[PDB]
Amino acid sequence: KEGSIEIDIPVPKYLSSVSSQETQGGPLAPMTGTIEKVFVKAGDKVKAGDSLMVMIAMKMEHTIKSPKDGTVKKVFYREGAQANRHTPLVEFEEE
Amino acid sequence: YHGDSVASLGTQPDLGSALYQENYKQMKALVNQLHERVEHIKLGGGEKARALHISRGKLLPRERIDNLIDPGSPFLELSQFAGYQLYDNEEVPGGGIITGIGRVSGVECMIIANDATVKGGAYYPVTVKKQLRAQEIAMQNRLPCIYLVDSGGAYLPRQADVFPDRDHFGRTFYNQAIMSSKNIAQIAVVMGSCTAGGAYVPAMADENIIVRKQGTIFLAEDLGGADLHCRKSGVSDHWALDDHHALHLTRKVVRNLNYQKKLDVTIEPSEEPLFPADELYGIVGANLKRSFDVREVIARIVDGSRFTEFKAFYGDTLVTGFARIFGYPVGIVGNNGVLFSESAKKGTHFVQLCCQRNIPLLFLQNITGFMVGREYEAEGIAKDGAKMVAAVACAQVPKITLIIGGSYGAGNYGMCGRAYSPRFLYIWPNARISVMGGEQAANVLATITKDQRAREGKQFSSADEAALKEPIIKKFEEEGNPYYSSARVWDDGIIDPADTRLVLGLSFSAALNAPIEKTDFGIFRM
Amino acid sequence: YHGDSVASLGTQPDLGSALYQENYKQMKALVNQLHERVEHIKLGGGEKARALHISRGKLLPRERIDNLIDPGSPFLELSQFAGYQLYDNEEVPGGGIITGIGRVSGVECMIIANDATVKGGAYYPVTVKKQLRAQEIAMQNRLPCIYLVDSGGAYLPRQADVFPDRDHFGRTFYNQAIMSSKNIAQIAVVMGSCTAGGAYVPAMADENIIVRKQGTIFLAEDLGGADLHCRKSGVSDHWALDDHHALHLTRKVVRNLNYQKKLDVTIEPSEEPLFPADELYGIVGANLKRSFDVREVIARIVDGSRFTEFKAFYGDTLVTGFARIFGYPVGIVGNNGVLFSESAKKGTHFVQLCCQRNIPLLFLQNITGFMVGREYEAEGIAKDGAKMVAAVACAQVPKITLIIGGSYGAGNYGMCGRAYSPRFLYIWPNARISVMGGEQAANVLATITKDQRAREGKQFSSADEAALKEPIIKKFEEEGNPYYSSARVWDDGIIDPADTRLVLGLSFSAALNAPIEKTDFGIFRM
Amino acid sequence: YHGDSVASLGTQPDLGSALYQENYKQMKALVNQLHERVEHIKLGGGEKARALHISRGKLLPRERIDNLIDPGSPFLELSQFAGYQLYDNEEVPGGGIITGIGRVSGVECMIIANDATVKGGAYYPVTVKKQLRAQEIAMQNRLPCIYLVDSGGAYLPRQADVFPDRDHFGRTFYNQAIMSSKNIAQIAVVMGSCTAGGAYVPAMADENIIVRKQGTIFLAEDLGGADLHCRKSGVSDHWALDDHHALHLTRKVVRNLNYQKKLDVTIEPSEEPLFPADELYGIVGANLKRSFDVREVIARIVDGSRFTEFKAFYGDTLVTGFARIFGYPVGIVGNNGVLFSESAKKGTHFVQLCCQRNIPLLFLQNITGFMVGREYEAEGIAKDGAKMVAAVACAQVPKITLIIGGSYGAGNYGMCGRAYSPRFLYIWPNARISVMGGEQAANVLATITKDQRAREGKQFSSADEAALKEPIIKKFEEEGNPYYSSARVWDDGIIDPADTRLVLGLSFSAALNAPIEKTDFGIFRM
């Protein structure tokens, strides 16, 4: 009744998967929504914070931004497509 | 204390990848082909034969099994494809006999029922082999045997392959006598005519049930299966009005066996694997030339996808470790490449560990073709491969083998082939089995001819070589097909990969009906 | 039906009595002395050695055990005082090795860890004896052995007492091989350098775990304990990143032993004794000349202070009866005075009863000095005392001995001394052990001298006699001290009397891991 | 059919060669030294003690044995040199006890007689160890034990090393009780005073004989060993007039044991070796640095010098093969150089063969110093040497070890050292035993010091190093001498090489009194 407190138990490194997949293919759609704008061509050099796509979900605008300064290998969606939640939007060239 | 958190096997496959899409499509077609062929075999002799069978008041053979086993219990049928295209112009669905393991009155039993709609229930050479295989399974696991007898005798045109030899029809009665001496109940239900030489099956049984009007036993009603057999002759222990009554009586007989199952192994609560089983379609595919990580297969069949690997970095072409399937402990040995000296040594060490602790063993055979390596000084492999052949043979823990890929040459023996008496042996629809792979054989043939041609001095032209090679490749493909092998009883059935976990769970559960014995090894040639 | 009301042992001591006050004060001082000495031994080599040990990323030996055993489980350490003042100028806390019984993954195991902070983990003669004692305990009770290996090899200056003989370092590998042949798991974790001749310990183990950077195994990283040992050489079964990872792996290995404990004895719900245990301080004291009723000790350790005495009025100097400790049935034999012919006969009868019913035996040794009786025609005692020595030796039920007082002469043998292989042997801080009591020895020496002096005619003066006597008394006191005896491994530890019930409960629980065998007796010389 | 002609081992040595002349001269001197020292030990306490002993009408201890055993039968005495210079100022010839194996009434028995002329028969620490070793030999071979009891009790000045521990005096009665329970007859003859605690030995025996006037048993004539002990007390089973009468009674007692020897092994007629045994003097010599072919030793002890070598060209540093000694089959393992991985594997394979066929094993230890090879990547040896240590330990066939040369480090363990319970262990007068050879130890010490000196920067001069080295070399020589080792009971005796065949024949014959058990091996780390 005073309040609520959360305490975290440290996770041993061994149990944590060593060398987890490191590369993330673009921010994942915040939710299932229509793609309203695409700002990136099949091969485009982008810097962190460069808007890649705009998505409207339940009437709420989200702008996807570039995670890395890597050039874009490919785009998985085009304008007007409906993208499901947590589906890769952009592929980045391996560096 | 069992609260420790542990790592789990498996990774999420790339469903979008073209390889996964192609592999899933190919494997799915094989599974669909397997399903529809079984549907046809399900019909037995055919509509005319089935209509005649029912017209006599008798149940269809598969309906008899449905009524015999406990309501809703799974039934593990064996060798569904026996006799598939085995004989040139005769169709013998399932070999004329249905065998499997089901639960009767809460007890796991082996059920052997003649299919009277197929050639009137006559015994073809494959029919004897299928029955003998079922009896071997029942004895090794101490499973009571129930014979639903409706037979027409031996097939005279092929008598030489049925009557005379040790593994011929005579062995059937020998097995019954031996199991009876070991207190493995033998129950016979005569639900149709018992022909000459089949009259022994009711007589050799511990307890016997005969149907009033349909049943006839004679070495027709007056001669045998008569009220004479039930009362005057005394061959019958129970008298049944119809097929339904006889099946009800059989359940009562099993309930009076005074048997209770006891487990020799430790048990832990069951858990489902962390990954879908149908993903095995994309992961494995149908192309044996491509390679996959066997750990992916393991991750999708073991409880919670938990696996403790043994000697992970030594002899990496072989994977060994401990897991649990439906709560049972299991030691898994699976191929992950070409066998090496280190791999054989690693396997031999692992098999000793499992035998010491009385842990059942599961083998996943996927041997590789020699296209990658012509010889690789295989003489080194011979010295070590034998150590594994010798440990696997002497192991007394229950052994189950699953062929998920190729099975060629001496690699088959080291991985507990049919010759090494695994309790069960199953194959996936994409497997191939042969003395050597087809291509290698062709090359071998080519060299001999080219050189001999050289002694003559006659020129073996490039065309000549190809012409020689093509028939050989064809023969090997035809004879390594999963269907050829299963048509003859080399395995206990072709199973859908999505059903692998269920089949293994049922098989290991049945194998645990017998106590695990101590293992005695021969000399290990160090 | 277990609802019968029964009588209970024990009486309330007179806390106000001067004797109780004095006895409590003396015993308390001994316990406090015992506690603080263990605290010093707890520190091992010292601050500089401990700081160096941690600087290499390794856990301290006792922290390793804490992480290995189940959370919060008690740990029964053995022979804490091995090597206490054993060597003239060298301090070897605990003998350089820590041994005890703890629960790993719910299984009772024997843990043997080298203390690298003590002389770099070198093996002193007492170190070998302590390890050999631990292995003997593990084999007799079928306890899996876990070796936390961090050693520097044998101590060359004392090689003759380490290498050659049967009970020398070589016996360690012999014990490992024998236990492995009996399916008593041998698990080795190399958490530090394995020196010449210690490389065998990882190799002789059934399963082996080695730390990535710290571990080295060679008959340094390149020569042994290398990725070479883990992969190229194959000596390593598991590869661990650090000490924490290795301990986690060890717990997984034990969980896969496929072992479940089974009890041969009947079990009843546990109950605490009806009297406080700390009252034993006042009751017993530290003066061995005074006598106390052993029943008082029994009343404060058995469940509910319930005791069924056998032959109470016959041979009253010995007390025998049935009780229960933590639910286990136990037959208790304790001294209550000088041994007589009736006492020996009564004991022999009782031991046969316990062996017939497979009941564990507990001995409470408190033998009396001969100050009260010079001879008492001890020739009669010889004829009967042997009957008890012979019954006790042949008994196959688990036997535990607790020395709560004196232990002199043949009385030690009859009460299951160290020579008679009790599963465990413990001593209270007030005990004394010798061939004879010190005073008697002096008298014996005096008589011989006085008489021989008489033959010479030289006068042995009263002063001369006293002078002769004093050194003898001193030697006997020094050598009978509980610390002298425990420094060498004659007992498994010195225990606080208030902890007697807990130690017995843990010890009997461990001893029940092995099935109780049938007892075969020799000829009873009637 | 046994008429096949076969090849024979051995070659004629070059008697004229200087090496042979020198080797013969050196070995002969050692044998002469051994003989004359035994002559002195033969006299026991001395003329005054012997004269006093006879003056009481008692036979001398060795005359008692001569009269006890069958006329003209050989007597295999054990540990003749126990206590040789063991104690600083006290001479204890033979440890005060005479033990050996002889034939009584046609039955092989172990005879344990106290030497009353040595310190009045008091039990020194070595005396207890010698007796315990004799009892261990009797139990392992099922030899009846005859105790010629004439003792003065424990040696009080060294009580702490006699009374308390498991392998101390108490164990003597434990062994008697265990052997009696196994139907291994225990016969005691009290031919002199039985002191306190020795009165148990007559009582713990199955059958007992006491001399009328001399014998006294009490925990003097009136108190014990009285007509009271013979009749009133009943401790005595037979009453003897004198020593001669008691020995005659003992022979009658053994004849009534209802025992007949049965052989588990095949037997062939005996044949003498084709070469003289005394040539071993020239072949072997006394210089351990020089090397000889162990086959030469074998050729001069086996029947007809016939030997079937196993894996002759593989791991040639080790020699293994089958032969026969006095008709018994034997598998011989002998060192012929430094142990390698191939040698260890070859030995492990051979030991499995002998255990499978129940063939006794004989080991000939001659390990080599590391002067030739500093390391040779000994890490490889560790992986394989253990396989041999583990096979040798688990072998259940009778094992006899003969040290004909050096015995250092882990090579001792692999060749069935004292720690591995060989039925008998003998050493030639030229042997040396240590943790490592002396020179190597010095080098090791030198390196540590030189480097530590370097950290200080203080110069370790060449002289400084030599000064450090000399004491170490001396210690190792003193402590590896055959006499040091035999003085303590590490071996069962020092034997003349010319007597090797006879000693082995007697030892193997005695070891065959017990049935050969099946061998159970542990896990072979492949």
Ligand SMILES: O=CCCCC[C@@H]1SC[C@@H]2NC(=O)N[C@@H]21
């Ligand atoms: O369409 C769903 C409801 C909210 C958006 C509708 C917009 S609000 C501006 C405009 N005026 C209307 O009456 N409807 C649209």
